[PDB]
């Protein structure tokens, strides 16, 4: 029975090595990856490998691992795929850490834009879980701790961790993560996955997927916004996406809105993730 090896990048940033049968499904190996991490809401995250046009797409779990990643490397990380609106009503601590994780590289990165403040208080609430009560024997007047906080660090910042830090003086770790989720949870693009494309009349815009619905980011004035209950099909065509909004209060018909996305498989990926989106956040 031929077995293929996988590597996992963890949101912790190491390496989790395994085996699975060649022809393995993308639960079978998730599994492997949950149990390793000791996660039961294991419905909350999944695996994202690199496609040939090195874009990150999520592993199927009901799909052959081999079908998707083609003829791609057996590399994969672990990632939140549905991010909770509210973390607080998670059953496990655990879960709420691996949240934390994902988020924390979700600041560094850049995709979760945060302010000066925010970062400061996420930042020192990491500090609190992990180093637990500020030691001011581990915090000179010019301490710059291993933590990443933040896509462009500064003196300041650092400063501000440290100021927070010493507020948080007997706090638990889980205590600790869940102040982080409770600040985290509400950044205006807290779960939010971005994809480029154009309107209808070839204006390049961002449309964003997240637990409300589908926004539509034009301008900084202009700001679209549809809720998942409001989108009746969700469908792609060639490098074209187009979503039937449902009709207002006694209108006769839907409307159909259009998109041009980069290509053919950039559609497919965003009409995934939409479908999954309005699936699990329909059911939530
Ligand atoms: Cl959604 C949302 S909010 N910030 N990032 C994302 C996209 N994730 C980040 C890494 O894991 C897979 C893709």
Same mark, same amino acid.
């Given at each position: 029975?031929?077995?293929?090896?996988?590597?996992?990048?963890?949101?912790?940033? &190491?390496?989790?090595?395994?085996?699975?049968?060649?022809?393995?499904?993308?639960?079978?190996?998730?599994?492997?990856?949950?149990?390793? $991490?000791?996660?039961?809401?294991?419905?909350? =995250?999944?695996?994202?490998?690199?496609?040939?046009?090195?874009?990150?797409?999520? $592993?199927? /779990?009901?799909?052959?691992?081999?079908?998707?990643?083609?003829?791609?490397?057996?590399?994969? &990380? =672990?990632?939140?795929?549905?991010?909770?609106?509210?973390?607080?009503? %998670?059953?496990?601590?655990?879960?709420?850490?691996?949240?934390?994780?994902?988020?924390?590289?979700?600041?560094?990165?850049?995709?979760?834009?945060?302010?000066?403040?925010? $970062?400061?208080? %996420?930042?020192?609430?990491?500090?609190?879980?992990?180093?637990?009560?500020?030691?001011?024997?581990?915090?000179?007047?010019?301490?710059?701790?291993?933590?990443?906080?933040?896509? @462009? !660090?500064?003196?300041?910042?650092?400063?501000?961790?440290?100021?927070?830090?010493?507020?948080?003086?007997?706090?638990?770790?889980?205590?600790?993560?869940?102040?982080?989720?409770?600040? *985290?949870?509400? $950044? &205006?693009?807290?779960?939010?996955?971005?994809? !480029?494309?154009?309107?209808?009349?070839?204006?390049?815009?961002?449309?964003?997927?997240?637990? &409300?619905?589908?926004?539509?980011?034009?301008?900084?004035?202009?700001?679209?916004?549809? *809720?998942?209950?409001?989108?009746?099909?969700?469908?792609?065509?060639?490098? @074209?996406?187009?979503?039937?909004?449902? /009709?207002?209060? =006694?209108?006769? +018909?839907?409307?159909?809105?259009? +998109?041009?996305?980069?290509? !053919?498989?950039?559609?497919?990926?965003?009409?995934?993730?939409?479908?999954?989106?309005?699936? +699990? =956040?329909?059911?939530?």
């Amino acid at each position: 029975p031929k077995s293929m090896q996988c590597k996992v990048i963890l949101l912790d940033g &190491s390496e989790y090595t395994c085996d699975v049968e060649k022809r393995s499904r993308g639960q079978v190996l998730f599994d492997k990856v949950c149990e390793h $991490l000791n996660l039961l809401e294991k419905d909350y =995250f999944g695996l994202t490998y690199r496609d040939a046009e090195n874009q990150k797409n999520w $592993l199927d /779990p009901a799909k052959e691992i081999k079908k998707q990643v083609r003829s791609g490397a057996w590399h994969f &990380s =672990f990632n939140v795929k549905f991010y909770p609106p509210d973390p607080a009503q %998670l059953s496990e601590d655990i879960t709420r850490y691996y949240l934390c994780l994902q988020l924390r590289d979700d600041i560094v990165s850049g995709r979760l834009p945060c302010s000066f403040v925010t $970062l400061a208080l %996420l930042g020192s609430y990491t500090v609190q879980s992990e180093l637990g009560d500020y030691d001011p024997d581990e915090c000179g007047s010019d301490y710059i701790s291993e933590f990443r906080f933040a896509p @462009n !660090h500064t003196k300041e910042l650092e400063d501000k961790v440290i100021e927070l830090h010493k507020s948080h003086r007997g706090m638990t770790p889980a205590e600790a993560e869940m102040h982080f989720l409770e600040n *985290a949870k509400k $950044l &205006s693009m807290y779960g939010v996955d971005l994809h !480029h494309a154009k309107d209808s009349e070839g204006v390049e815009i961002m449309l964003g997927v997240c637990a &409300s619905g589908l926004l539509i980011y034009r301008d900084r004035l202009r700001i679209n916004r549809f *809720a998942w209950p409001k989108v009746l099909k969700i469908s792609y065509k060639r490098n @074209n996406f187009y979503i039937k909004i449902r /009709p207002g209060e =006694f209108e006769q +018909f839907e409307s159909t809105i259009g +998109f041009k996305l980069p290509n !053919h498989r950039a559609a497919k990926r965003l009409w995934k993730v939409c479908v999954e989106h309005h699936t +699990f =956040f329909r059911l939530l």
